[PDB]
Amino acid sequence: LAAGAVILRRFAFNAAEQLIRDINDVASQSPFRQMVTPGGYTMSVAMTNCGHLGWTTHRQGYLYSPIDPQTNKPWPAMPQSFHNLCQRAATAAGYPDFQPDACLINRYAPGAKLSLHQDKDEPDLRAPIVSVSLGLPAIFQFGGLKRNDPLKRLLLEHGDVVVWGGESRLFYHGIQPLKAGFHPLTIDCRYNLTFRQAG
Ligand SMILES: [Fe+2]
C-alpha cells in the first residue's frame, strides 16, 4: 500500500521490445555510465537520459542538465515509444496533462543496488513520476516522509508501470541488490525508465 501510487503491472509488456531497441539507440549517443556521487563514490546502477533535460550528479549536488557531462553533447531526444507509453500510463492514472521533458534510464547489473533516497530535484513535487520496469525482477523498497519510517517491499517485474503521485512521490526509496538470472529480452539486466517533469 502506497497512497497516491497507481500500480499498473505488465502495462508495458507489448511496448517492451521497441523500448529496449530505443534504449540501445539512446545508449549509442549517451552511454550508460556509473555516475560519481558528490562524495566521490561511483554508483552501482549505470545511468543515462533522454529528453530535453537529464538527471546527473555534479560537484555541489544533484541537478538536471540539458547537456550530458560525459559526452558534452545534449541528451538524445525522447523516443516516440517512450512518449507514447508514458502518455498512456499517465492518462490511465488520472494525469492526462503530464508532459515529461526528462527520462532517467537506470541499468541494473546483477548485484547492483540503490540505497534510500528521495527524488526532489524537480520544481513541482505535485507532478508524478512514471516508472517503467524492463527485464530481470527487482525489489523496490520504500519508507515514508522520514528516513527511519517502516520499510515496505514491492517486486517490480518486466513491463510493470507505476505512476508515483500524491504522497508516494515523496517517499524515501531504493532497490535491493539485483538477483542474478536470465531474461529473453535484456539477457542479464534490468532497465528502469523514470519520466519526470523537470523544467
Ligand atoms: Fe529514486
Hey, what domains does the chain have and what are their CATH numbers? 1-199 (2.60.120.590)
Q: Which residues of 174-199 are buried (b: 16+ CB within 10 A; e: fewer)?
A: ebeebeeeebeebeebbbbbbbbbbe
| 108 is annotated as contributing to ligand binding | yes
* Other residues' Cβ atoms within 10 Å of the Cβ of residue 127: 17
Give Cβ neighbours of residue 36 (< 8 Å, ≥ 6 apart).
42, 43, 57
Give Cβ neighbours of residue 160 (< 8 Å, ≥ 6 apart).
7, 8, 9, 10, 11, 12, 131, 132, 133
| 107 is annotated as contributing to ligand binding | yes
Q: Terminus-to-terminus CA distance in the chain, angstroms?
A: 30
Q: How far apart are CA 117 and CA 173, in angstroms?
A: 5
Give Cβ neighbours of residue 130 (< 8 Å, ≥ 6 apart).
86, 89, 90, 98, 100, 161, 162, 163, 164, 193, 194, 195
| 186 is annotated as contributing to ligand binding | no
| 106 is annotated as contributing to ligand binding | yes
Q: State the distance from the centre of ligand 1 to the C-alpha of 71, rounded, in angstroms.
A: 24
Residue count of the chain, please give it.
Answer: 199
Q: State the distance from the centre of ligand 1 to the C-alpha of 47, rounded, in angstroms.
A: 12
The grid cell for 178 is 539485483
Helix or strand run (H / E) with residue 55: strand 54-58
- Output the CA torsion 2→153→157→33 (10° steps): 100
Q: How far apart are CA 83 and CA 86, in angstroms?
A: 5
Question: In a 3-state reduction of DSSP, which class is residue 56?
Answer: strand
Task: Give the sign of the dihedral formed by CA 99, CA 43, CA 183, CA 119.
Answer: negative
Q: State the distance from the centre of ligand 1 to the C-alpha of 119, rounded, in angstroms.
A: 5
Q: State the distance from the centre of ligand 1 to the C-alpha of 26, rounded, in angstroms.
A: 21
Burial bucket for residue 153 (CB in 10 Å: 0-12, 13-18, 19+): exposed
Burial bucket for residue 135 (CB in 10 Å: 0-12, 13-18, 19+): buried
Angle at 164 between CA 144 and CA 47, to 5 degrees: 95
Q: How far apart are CA 24 and CA 30, in angstroms?
A: 10
CB 37 within 8 A of CB 151: no
The grid cell for 94 is 488520472
| 88 is annotated as contributing to ligand binding | no
Q: Calculate the CA 42 to chain-centre distance.
A: 18
Q: State the distance from the centre of ligand 1 to the C-alpha of 175, rounded, in angstroms.
A: 9
| 56 is annotated as contributing to ligand binding | no
Q: State the distance from the centre of ligand 1 to the C-alpha of 120, rounded, in angstroms.
A: 9
Q: How was this structure determined?
A: X-ray
| 183 is annotated as contributing to ligand binding | no
The grid cell for 111 is 548485484
CB 170 within 8 A of CB 118: yes
Q: How far apart are CA 100 and CA 198, in angstroms?
A: 7
